Design a protein around this ligand. Structure first.
Ligand SMILES: NC(=O)Nc1sc(-c2ccccc2)cc1C(N)=O
Length: 272
């Protein structure tokens, strides 16, 4: 990672929290192309000092997103490790994360919007699958809306996939259980089972989010009941707008080897 000096970063408003992290809008002072000075809006992701022992996994998550370059993958600008800080500096996305956007805009998001976003997410995941690169935490909170839909210009929405955060392979078991049904059953059984098939299951859960207007699947179940949901081999209920429910369930296959390739997922989406 490129090293960014603390003196070149300004922290502004809080944008929320992730697992052992706090996120802020900020400004980065930098020399850009042609030697021009810029004050660039950035996303500042800060690892909690209490959890500094996760720094390796924290940065490895972002390293994963920068191994490859792709129009649907969030840009990392660098890191700031001055003083006692562990900070990831990323591109700032004006419209924020997709979970919040879905909850706030539930009434004006139709089937075609959901289908377009699903196709773009599947394109990003196909690129990762072709590169045999595991993401490990696909969810609407890790999808960023770059551009809103604009029917006046026919322009679709445009999304990017953000980094997965600290890996489920090192997180405490209680956090993994609270992350059911994004974390697949085989990873509840053994977090070292993390594999490309993991991301197919979590993609299914994320499509359910996209189709459910901000709702979180199984939110009414406490951790013990989420575990039993997997033990009883249940599937999620179909979203009220159920156009993608069969795809969701085919992706959330309890047999990892039976989950469809992202090429097949894309073909299915294109058939609708
Ligand atoms: N890369 C990036 O910008 N990530 C962003 S921006 C954002 C946001 C923006 C405006 C109002 C409220 C929240 C949230 C998050 C996130 N969860 O990552």
């Amino acid at each position: 990672f490129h090293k960014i000096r603390n003196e070149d970063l300004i922290f502004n408003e809080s944008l929320g929290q992730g697992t052992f992290t706090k996120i802020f809008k900020g400004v980065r002072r930098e020399v850009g192309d042609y030697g021009q000075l810029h004050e660039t809006e950035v996303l500042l992701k800060v690892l909690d000092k209490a959890h500094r022992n996760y720094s390796e996994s924290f940065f490895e998550a972002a390293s994963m997103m920068s191994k490859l370059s792709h129009k649907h993958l969030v840009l990392n600008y660098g890191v700031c490790v001055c003083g006692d800080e562990n900070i990831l500096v990323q591109e700032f996305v004006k419209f924020g994360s997709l979970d919040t956007y879905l909850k706030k805009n539930k009434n004006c998001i139709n089937i075609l919007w959901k289908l377009e976003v699903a196709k773009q997410l599947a394109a990003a995941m196909h690129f990762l699958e072709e590169n045999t690169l595991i993401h490990g935490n696909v969810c609407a909170k890790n999808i960023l809306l770059i551009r809103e839909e604009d029917r006046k210009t026919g322009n679709p929405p445009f999304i990017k996939l953000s980094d997965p955060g600290i890996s489920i392979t090192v997180l405490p078991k209680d956090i993994l259980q609270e992350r059911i049904p994004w974390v697949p059953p085989e990873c509840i059984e053994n977090p070292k089972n993390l594999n490309l098939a993991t991301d197919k299951w979590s993609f299914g859960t994320t499509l359910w989010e996209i189709c459910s207007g901000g709702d979180k699947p199984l939110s009414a179940l406490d951790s013990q009941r989420k575990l039993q949901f997997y033990e009883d081999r249940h599937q999620l209920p179909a979203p009220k707008a159920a156009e993608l429910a069969n795809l969701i369930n085919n992706c959330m296959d309890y047999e990892p080897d039976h989950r469809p390739s992202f090429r097949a997922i894309i073909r299915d989406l294109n058939s609708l």
